[PDB]
């Protein structure tokens, strides 16, 4: 095993550790493509944890600096200040693919501003936040999962990631409340007459369910639109991308089955992921 192989294997470990939902799915891709995804994931994961988990704001500045170094001198050797193995894998990927560097910068700014967390006043603010933390990952992942780097591709990728961030939000309402975060907007929260602190203490009710179902309906609808343009992706990636999404559509059925509980984190069982994959491949 070469050194670079080792760098990608460290990225793989990080994704296996933190992505209980998607590691399984993305590892089904051909080697070159899944190695790039592990790199991207590891970069995004370090960024998202820089502050949330290590509290470390200097570390986040170093990640930005490191990405900035790769963008300007893709071919020079750099003394990476954040995590060397991840940045080497990322520079290796940038020498073969067209990395949307601005998208990592948008993600970094969105993760940063999340330390001045202020509830969204409207859905448009919530949706612009889904772009920043997940539409951007769709954009950076675009040249890896497709040979047609065109606006329709970027656009389905962006729309898929924002859509998964919404499902994510619907799965994590309760744990996000414990961390003092409510991602639903005030406009919509007032309109459905819900106070999350309250529903958290006394259980679900019918206003909360309707609020939640109002957002799940937005996510499901968007899921179906990207499932009609799944062909913008490479042929090897299409069933994986579809598996990734459906796992998350599954999580919504899991929240419904646990009666929208705010006190547990529903997940999808590995065995079930393999089933979903089997069905997708039926028509693939
Ligand atoms: C493929 C494509 C074109 C677009 C999709 C872009 C993606 C994958 C965006 C990320 C969406 C989110 C919120 C993922 C959870 S990461 P996690 O590791 O925390 O997952 P988990 O919390 O275990 O469910
Ligand atoms: C899967 C893939 C290709 C890309 C994802 C890249 C990542 C990790 C981006 C950082 C922003 C996200 C989606 C964090 C997890 S949201 P959460 O509710 O799961 O909270 P968490 O940080 O996981 O505890
Ligand atoms: Mg997670
Ligand atoms: Mg996080
Ligand atoms: Mg969450």
Swiss-Prot record:
Mg(2+) 2 binds at residues 168, 172. It is an enzyme of class 2 (transferase). CDD domains: Trans_IPPS_HH. Binds 2 Mg(2+) ions per subunit. A third Mg(2+) ion binds between the 2 farnesyl diphosphate (FPP). This is 4,4'-diapophytoene synthase. (2E,6E)-farnesyl diphosphate 1 binds at residues 18-21, 41, 45, 171, 248. The keyword Nucleus does not apply. The keyword Magnesium applies. Its EC number is 2.5.1.96. One of its GO terms (molecular function) is metal ion binding. The lineage of its organism: Bacteria, Bacillati, Bacillota, Bacilli, Bacillales. One of its GO terms (biological process) is carotenoid biosynthetic process. It comes from Staphylococcus aureus. It catalyses: 2 (2E,6E)-farnesyl diphosphate = 15-cis-4,4'-diapophytoene + 2 diphosphate. Pathway: Carotenoid biosynthesis; staphyloxanthin biosynthesis; staphyloxanthin from farnesyl diphosphate: step 1/5. Gene3D superfamilies: Farnesyl Diphosphate Synthase. InterPro entries: Isoprenoid_synthase_dom_sf (IPR008949), Squ/phyt_synthse (IPR002060), Squalene/phytoene_synthase_CS (IPR019845), Trans_IPPS_bact-type (IPR044843), Trans_IPPS_HH (IPR033904). Keywords: Carotenoid biosynthesis, Magnesium, Metal-binding, Transferase, Virulence. Involved in the biosynthesis of the yellow-orange carotenoid staphyloxanthin, which plays a role in the virulence via its protective function against oxidative stress. Catalyzes the head-to-head condensation of two molecules of farnesyl diphosphate (FPP) into the colorless C(30) carotenoid 4,4'-diapophytoene (dehydrosqualene). Belongs to the phytoene/squalene synthase family. CrtM subfamily. Mg(2+) 1 binds at residues 48, 52. (2E,6E)-farnesyl diphosphate 2 binds at residues 45, 165. Its cofactor is Mg(2+).
């Amino acid at each position: 095993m070469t050194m670079m192989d080792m760098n990608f294997k460290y990225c793989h470990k990080i994704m296996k550790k933190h992505s209980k939902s998607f590691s399984y799915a993305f590892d089904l891709l051909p080697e070159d493509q899944r190695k790039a995804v592990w790199a991207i994931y590891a970069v995004c994961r370090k960024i998202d944890d820089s502050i949330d988990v290590y509290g470390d704001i200097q570390f986040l500045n170093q990640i930005k600096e490191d990405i900035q170094s790769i963008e300007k001198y893709p071919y020079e050797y750099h003394h990476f200040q954040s995590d060397r193995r991840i940045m080497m894998a990322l520079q290796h990927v940038a020498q073969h693919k067209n990395i949307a560097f601005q998208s990592f910068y948008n993600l970094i700014d969105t993760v940063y501003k999340d330390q001045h967390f202020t509830m969204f006043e409207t859905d448009a603010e919530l949706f612009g936040y889904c772009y920043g933390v997940a539409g951007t990952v769709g954009e950076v992942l675009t040249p890896i999962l497709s040979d047609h780097e065109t606006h329709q591709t970027y656009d389905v990728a962006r729309r898929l990631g924002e859509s998964l961030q919404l499902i994510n939000i619907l799965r994590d309402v309760g744990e996000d409340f414990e961390n003092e975060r409510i991602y639903f907007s005030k406009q919509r929260l007032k309109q459905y007459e819900v106070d999350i602190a309250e529903v958290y203490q006394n259980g679900v009710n019918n206003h909360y369910i309707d609020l939640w179902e109002y957002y799940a309906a937005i996510a499901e609808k968007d899921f179906r639109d990207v499932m009609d343009q799944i062909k913008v992706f490479s042929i090897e990636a299409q069933p994986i991308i579809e598996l990734a999404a459906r796992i998350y559509i599954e999580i919504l059925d899991e929240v419904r089955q646990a009666n929208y509980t705010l006190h547990e984190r529903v997940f999808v069982e590995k065995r079930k992921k393999a089933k979903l994959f089997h069905e997708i491949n039926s028509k693939y």
